[PDB]
Design a protein around this ligand. Structure first.
Ligand SMILES: *C(=N)[C@H](C[C@@H]1CCNC1=O)NC(=O)[C@@H](NC(=O)[C@@H](NC(=O)NC(C)(C)C)C(C)(C)C)[C@]12C[C@H]3C[C@H](C[C@H](C3)C1)C2
Ligand SMILES: *C(=N)[C@H](C[C@@H]1CCNC1=O)NC(=O)[C@@H](NC(=O)[C@@H](NC(=O)NC(C)(C)C)C(C)(C)C)[C@]12C[C@H]3C[C@H](C[C@H](C3)C1)C2
Lengths: 306, 306
């Protein structure tokens, strides 16, 4: 029993992190086969970031402007190119610890683990969700750019996020591993802000199921509601609307607990309207929306990774 | 910026996990050099655990009663012995991925990362604290015994916990890596319960500093209090008493924020007496006590590991 904010084991990713220096700027890079992926703003100086012109900036660089260190070993850069907001550095050595991997662009609501890194060295791992406004609520200090987010499916590491910047509200924005930003952000020093965030409803329900699986039942009631009736209440409190795909996704959890999704929705409606009254659920005094239905199944039924 | 429940990167530990089978029982073991460490109850059958007699049970076993798998490779067991509640299985091959390591018995209030495992395979990593009643609030399913807790100091992995059992309140109990239980528990199927828990005061203060470092200042006030005055209020709400060592430990955080420990204590006194009134701190509606002062420094100043 028990329920924790649980991250994926990070070993397979730790062996792919390297340090990348261009000029005075050092950040992290991801070394898979003979390519090192990193944020393209490593080729910038302070005079550039007002409105950098990355095509020009990259044409003025040569392979020897790039210092790549894997631990103590220097890697020789034999080619470079730009894809959207990422730089790809061809190196002369293929990473012998390259795991089976793929690049995935995730959807808001999905979760992933972040391996926070500084100077090529792993500092810590934690779990977070892509918010509906395409930010994540991370923990990042100077030098953290190029840190990656990932999932593990059976044996395949799915990379989905590379860190680029922090917004004035203290949240974080980055790209997929092909360099496309999540959300409307750009890699320039210009004023940007996240849109308003909403609560991920399907995830709150998944977490209520986890609570039931673990013996926190005080919020259940005998009522039912309809999708239409529930969604009307949801938008009033800034919750994402619930869809039929969401209902179907929650199926396994409904099955294991014997509570129908629409039953659970009437409990959630209740909690929105009267609050929790100093009671807690799974140790929290707030409704938690950073566990997906698959996260709950994984942690309450025990799937491992190879 | 940002603040997350952050675990240590798990790569160095993942390479030491193995599967251990004795008879019908399979659990996890820790393979360092040529020794595999695992809970001694792997030598039990259901008929035994009422009141097992482990000396007798172990004398009736031979080296070939133990099946150790590292991935697909079987390891040959060439010796066995018992130390307190752990079994040590000498194997014929030394683990080539053995990190620099040590065994540490931690104190209540300290935190560590748990690498939850099933059948020798890492399932996920999360952070938790030794509670004052010598339990941890973990997440463990059948087959999880032998999963280990650890810290990383510079390059050395410090193992401090091996998982054995779950108590009726849904919390968890285990041993250090020399087999001594934390707390008054024993490895038998007999009625056991944890003592009453208390809140780890020095950790709540460390987390209030983290909040200030991250811009949550609404709970500060201009008052000060005394250790004696604060501790009197603390015991009323089931908080650990604060000591002068605690004050000294909080020194770096006091220094970086300019708020004196005794200032911060008057804010905490305030929060105990009037609550939070629907406000949050660092995204939480409860006072959080599972971050040590060192955890806050590590995450708000950026230390890495090699
Ligand atoms: C990566 N190393 C770092 C990430 C930052 C550092 C602290 N926390 C983080 O997440 N990247 C940067 O230095 C970027 N700058 C910031 O994150 C920056 N915020 C900021 O200027 N925001 C707006 C106005 C929205 C652009 C602070 C340091 C937090 C104040 C970038 C990354 C690239 C694009 C852009 C210009 C530079 C190159 C610096 C932001
Ligand atoms: C290890 N594989 C497993 C850990 C458990 C399984 C589910 N969650 C966990 O943490 N160990 C056990 O099966 C132990 N049993 C329990 O944890 C058990 N609780 C229990 O009986 N508690 C008291 C009454 C306090 C002993 C449940 C499965 C949760 C109901 C042990 C481990 C060894 C000592 C003792 C007898 C057996 C050998 C089983 C408990």
């Amino acid at each position: 029993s028990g329920f924790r904010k649980m991250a994926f084991p990070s070993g397979k990713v730790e062996g792919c992190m390297v340090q990348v220096t261009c000029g005075t700027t050092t950040l992290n890079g991801l070394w898979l086969d003979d390519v090192v992926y990193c944020p393209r703003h490593v080729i910038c100086t302070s005079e550039d970031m007002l409105n950098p012109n990355y095509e020009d900036l990259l044409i003025r660089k040569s392979n020897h402007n790039f210092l790549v260190q894997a631990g103590n070993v220097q890697l020789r850069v034999i080619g470079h190119s730009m894809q959207n907001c990422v730089l790809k550095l061809k190196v002369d050595t293929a990473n012998p610890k390259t795991p089976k991997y793929k690049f995935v662009r995730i959807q808001p609501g999905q979760t992933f683990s972040v391996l926070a890194c500084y100077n090529g060295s792993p500092s810590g791992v934690y779990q977070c969700a892509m918010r509906p406004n395409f930010t994540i609520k991370g923990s990042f200090l100077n030098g953290s750019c190029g840190s990656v987010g990932f999932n593990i499916d059976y044996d395949c590491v799915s990379f989905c996020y590379m860190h680029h910047m922090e917004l004035p509200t203290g949240v974080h924005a980055g790209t997929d591993l092909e360099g496309n930003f999540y959300g409307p952000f750009v890699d320039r020093q210009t004023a940007q802000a996240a849109g308003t965030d909403t609560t991920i409803t399907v995830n709150v329900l998944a977490w209520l199921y986890a609570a039931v699986i673990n013996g926190d039942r005080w919020f259940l009631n005998r009522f039912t509601t309809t999708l239409n009736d529930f969604n009307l209440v949801a938008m009033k409190y800034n919750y994402e609307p619930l869809t039929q795909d969401h209902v179907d996704i929650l199926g396994p959890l409904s099955a294991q607990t014997g509570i129908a999704v629409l039953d659970m929705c009437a409990s959630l409606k209740e909690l929105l309207q009267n609050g929790m009254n100093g009671r807690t659920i799974l140790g929290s005094a707030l409704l938690e929306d950073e566990f997906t239905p698959f996260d709950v199944v994984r942690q309450c039924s025990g799937v491992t990774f190879q």
